[PDB]
Amino acid sequence: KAKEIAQQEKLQEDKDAKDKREKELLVAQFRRLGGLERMVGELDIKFDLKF
């Protein structure tokens, strides 16, 4: 009747999914030194303006 070891291992892979999104956010370049410029330069949007 302890057949609920399926749903206590649902909690644990939901936790490590949460941890993989935290890690993915930490090493994202737009949140790191000099990365915001690097990511802005990779954009394919072309303002046509002169002031």
Binding site: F30, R31, L33, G34, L36, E37
Partner: protein, 99 residues
């Protein structure tokens, strides 16, 4: 009383014992105090905060020409608000306190 064993306290600096040498780290301009990347680090957090007040009118111009009856029929009624108002939920969540 008579046992002969002189006591000699000693201080005796060691041989210099030159330990392994450190190396000066290669220069990293983006982590100096003068790096613009620190200001960018902060901008990521505080980005557009000083712009939300679009102007000295706070983005909210007062216009009495927006009130029917008033300014033409002298009908002050519409300034005192509707009574028994419904307040849709997407508006009703806006009376909350900050969090």
């Amino acid at each position: 009383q008579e046992y002969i064993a002189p006591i000699k306290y000693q201080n005796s600096l060691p041989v210099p014992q030159l330990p392994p040498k450190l190396l000066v780290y290669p220069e990293s301009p983006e982590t100096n105090a003068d790096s613009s990347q620190l200001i960018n680090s902060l901008y990521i957090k505080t980005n557009v905060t000083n712009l939300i007040q679009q102007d000295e009118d706070l983005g909210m111009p007062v216009d009495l020409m927006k009130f029917p009856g008033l300014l033409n029929k002298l009908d002050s009624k519409l300034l005192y608000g509707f009574d028994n108002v419904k307040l849709d939920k997407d508006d009703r969540i806006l009376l909350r306190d900050p969090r």
